[PDB]
């Protein structure tokens, strides 16, 4: 089998193995600051890319590789009843380019199809195509979710997420948990990774602030994944990774 | 650091790392058969425990482990609407012995004061200190949950489930997903293991079928478990274990 | 190819090419009364079938058929503040029965998983799986849709109904029309027959009053229907049918 | 009754069924393409019309006719931001000759009152007259539409168009459909054909880009139609035509 991983608790600025995008950038206290702030910049937008492409599925074999990835971020509202837009965990084409801001989460852009992109997004701010109240949703070339979760969310909150696709079950699982709060939140649906996304992808974050409000900043503060294509134990990624 | 863990897609009759109790056996089709059937017998107990005691938390440094565990069960119900008793995954003292049977699912005793067990239940039967509905459980020496949360459960059905520990927050977490339903359900709450478990411990599971009714039966399919005491990276037992 | 079609303007009591379960009757007006009225009455639950089976896919060919069906229904509530529960169109085994009432709309039942029944619902009650507001769904082995849309609902008044499926897109489509209102409400998403249906199945109406509540109850005025099964002209069937 | 209706998956060059005016022509590929290109050439404007006159409503008898159609189009955009100005669908008299480009679709004329011209339009340009964001509209001897519904189009997909008229209410149906995107948009109102049309009209489209910029390229793939004139089954038309 084919298999990668990695695992860092913080961030170090200038790091050659990863790909920043937007307003993007790596403090010296080693949080990757998606958005600008100075409170956040409205129209801000920043992405981050594992260097590395990741072998997702082959054409040969016809297998499909299994994944789990966990990290944890916040955000930071000024003014908890005005929140925009989301932060969001991604794979793409290798050559993926930041798309449009705010709502479309720098993922899609506005009357045209999406590319070959899977996402699970965070979404603090309901648009036209959104279900009341921010939540989590699982986005397969599409803004508009193939299914979504209320998302008990907290200002200012460490929120610990796991994300874990099986590829004997094709069923892709987001689980959020906030330590401090006891609280937790899952979802979960079948995506098929041969029909919506090529065979070599990048993965990485996407975080957008309000259009013309500063809605609220996004740090991711760790970040953990494996990979594993057959010609898994994920006990030991919650553990290990 | 102190690691253990291990991993089985199935099980296999006689084999000498396990620990059987009540009526609990191992069918040749590698299922582990906690009840007795003929359906369901009513007032059936029993258990199975890994033979090897587990480090859970050292005196002296004063240090506790993370752990996860990971396994599919299915309950057979001939009636959907006369449910009992349920499944648990517990840790307790190595010279841990089968309780009393129906709602104290095996762990404990009706007016007593229950051991050092710590279990996470899943609960078919509203016994008078139970909330309504099926529901999924973290219970502390007491067969009266710290915290519950409901179960969308499925007769016949394969659940996986993940349950994790992690002791820099206390917190533990437990998730149910039923594939073929795409439907999820997860908990969490802090459990603080060095004032509810000696240092040593075994873990296994127990189940019970109705007092007077045959209630349903339980089959665990596989097991995975990870346990780290130090002097972690769950995304590699997810995936790997 | 094989094809199978049949139209109504109304129907006739003891019509031997109907199969009619629980409260369903069709009365002297040509009405086919889905719930027992007297008023709607509580935990009614009725449902209407065409006797002859429908070759919906062939195993051999391993092609589907795409069909287009159309009719007219109404609701009546007494107090349209409370309202409960629905009706549904459904696609199911030959031999299927009635199953759960209330929430369940007669099709599924709590604690199981469906049987291999697609159905697009007109839901009138929020249930916890359920989205806020009546609603049109489409659900695919299970009382939880896989996609849903507001349903703007008038009492009494008559509303137009097309629900097609298109096998070489995987498309099904439903839109709802009230002709006085000008009001109008269209949903779509792909569905695959093959995996969630068996090659023959019987095609019906189901409805189901509140639990404890009158609800509302539904009457189906007209029918017509159109099957092309491949070794289609939807326009000659909304004009024709 | 009288009738009339035709189907094709086609086009096919010079085909003498039919009646090009403007740009209008039909590749070899089989596609009507509706509006120059070498990316789409400024103030383009192309309309095709069937040959045969419909028989839409009749003096004596004072009965109108019923009727549906369906067509796939698509456009393509250099620049999805720069949109301009859209296809229509319509009925006008036997005689009609292309009127005003841009905004005006080629159907209408600025400081004149439109002929008896009937249509459903795709818009893509906010002119004054128009509300914001793509829409379709349906449109009653003038360019300002008498009803409207926002258009969740997408660039170079084919969209699936359904137009129905039910003589009986009078009542006018369009419903668009994106199987690719799984996304759907319908409309209607009444409209008296009576009052805007004469009895014998040619049916056809009309598409137009931007003034001074591209705007888009429009090409019908496919297009089917029905009618019935009495002294109606559409979902033989549907899954028929
Ligand atoms: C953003 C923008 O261009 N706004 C112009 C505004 O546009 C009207 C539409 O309103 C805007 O719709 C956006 C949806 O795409 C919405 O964005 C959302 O923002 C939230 C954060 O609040 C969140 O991020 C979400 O994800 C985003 O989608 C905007 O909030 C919203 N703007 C407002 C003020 O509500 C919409 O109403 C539409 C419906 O018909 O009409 C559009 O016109 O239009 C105004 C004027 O009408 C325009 O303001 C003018 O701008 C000019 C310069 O461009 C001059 O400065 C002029 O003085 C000023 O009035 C906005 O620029
Ligand atoms: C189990 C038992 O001993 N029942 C005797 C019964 O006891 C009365 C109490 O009823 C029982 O309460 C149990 C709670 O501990 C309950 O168990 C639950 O069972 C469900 C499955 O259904 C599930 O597993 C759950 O987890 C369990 O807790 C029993 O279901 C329930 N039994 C019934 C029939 O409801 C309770 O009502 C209490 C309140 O005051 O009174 C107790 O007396 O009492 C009956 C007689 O009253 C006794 O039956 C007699 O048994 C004799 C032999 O022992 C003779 O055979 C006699 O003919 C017969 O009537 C039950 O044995
Ligand atoms: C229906 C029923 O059995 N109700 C008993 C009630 O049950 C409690 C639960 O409440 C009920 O939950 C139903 C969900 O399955 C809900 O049904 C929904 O009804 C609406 C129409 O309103 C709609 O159709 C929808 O689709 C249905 O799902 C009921 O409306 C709801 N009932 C009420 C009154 O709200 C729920 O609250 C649950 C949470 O813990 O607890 C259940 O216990 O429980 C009461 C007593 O608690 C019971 O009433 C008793 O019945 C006895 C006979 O069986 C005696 O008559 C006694 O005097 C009486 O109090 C209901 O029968
Ligand atoms: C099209 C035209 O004749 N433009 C002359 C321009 O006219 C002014 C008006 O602006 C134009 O208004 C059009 C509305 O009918 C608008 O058309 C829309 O185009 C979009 C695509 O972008 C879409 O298809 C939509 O459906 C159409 O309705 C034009 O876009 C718009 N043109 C511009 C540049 O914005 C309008 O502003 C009006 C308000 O008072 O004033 C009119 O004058 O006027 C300019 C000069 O003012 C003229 O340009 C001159 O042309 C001369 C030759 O005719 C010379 O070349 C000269 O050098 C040049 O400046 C435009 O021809
Ligand atoms: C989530 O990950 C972050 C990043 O490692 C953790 O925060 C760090 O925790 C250490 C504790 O050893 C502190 O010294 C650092 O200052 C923290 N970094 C930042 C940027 O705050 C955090 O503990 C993790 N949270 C959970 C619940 O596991
Ligand atoms: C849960 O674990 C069980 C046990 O391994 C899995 O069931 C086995 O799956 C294999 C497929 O390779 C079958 O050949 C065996 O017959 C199954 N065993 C039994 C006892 O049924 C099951 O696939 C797992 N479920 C999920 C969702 O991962
Ligand atoms: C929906 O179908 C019903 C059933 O045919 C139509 O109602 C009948 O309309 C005729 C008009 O010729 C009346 O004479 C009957 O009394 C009606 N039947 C009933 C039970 O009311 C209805 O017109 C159709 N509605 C639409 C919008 O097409
Ligand atoms: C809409 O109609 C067009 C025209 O027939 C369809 O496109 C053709 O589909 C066939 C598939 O058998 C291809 O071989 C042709 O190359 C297509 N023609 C063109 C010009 O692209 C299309 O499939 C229809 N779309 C839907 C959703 O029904
Ligand atoms: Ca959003
Ligand atoms: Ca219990
Ligand atoms: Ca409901
Ligand atoms: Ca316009
Ligand atoms: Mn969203
Ligand atoms: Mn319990
Ligand atoms: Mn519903
Ligand atoms: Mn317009």
Redo the contacts between chains.
């Keep these: 089998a084919e298999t990668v991983?990695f695992?860092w608790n913080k961030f170090v600025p200038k790091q050659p193995n990863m790909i920043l995008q937007g307003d993007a950038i790596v403090t010296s206290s080693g949080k990757l600051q998606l958005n600008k702030v100075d409170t956040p910049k409205p129209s801000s937008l920043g992405r981050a890319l594992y260097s590395t492409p990741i072998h997702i599925w082959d054409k040969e074999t016809g297998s499909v590789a299994?994944?789990?990835?966990?990290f944890n971020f916040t955000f930071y509202a000024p003014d908890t009843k005005r929140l925009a837009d989301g932060l969001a965990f991604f794979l793409a084409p290798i050559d993926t380019k930041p798309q449009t801001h705010a709502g479309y989460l720098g993922l899609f852009?506005?009357?045209?199809?999406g590319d070959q992109v899977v996402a699970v997004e965070f979404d603090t701010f309901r648009n036209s195509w959104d279900?009341?109240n921010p939540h989590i949703g699982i986005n397969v070339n599409?803004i508009?979710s193939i299914?979504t979760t209320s998302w008990d969310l907290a200002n200012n909150k460490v929120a610990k997420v796991?994300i874990?696709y099986?590829a004997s079950?094709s069923?892709l699982?987001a689980?959020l948990?906030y330590?401090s709060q006891?609280?937790?939140?899952?979802?979960?649906?079948?995506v098929d990774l041969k029909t919506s996304l090529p065979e070599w992808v990048r993965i990485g974050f996407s975080a957008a602030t309000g259009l013309d409000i500063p809605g609220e900043s996004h740090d991711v503060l760790s970040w953990?994944?494996?990979?594993?294509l057959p010609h898994?134990?994920?006990?030991?990624?919650?553990?290990?990774?």
């Design positions: 991983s695992s299994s994944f789990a990835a966990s852009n506005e009357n045209e199809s279900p009341p599409s508009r299914k796991l874990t099986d079950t069923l699982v689980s948990v330590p006891r609280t937790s939140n899952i979802l979960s649906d079948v953990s994944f494996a990979s594993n898994l134990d994920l006990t030991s990624f919650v553990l290990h990774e």
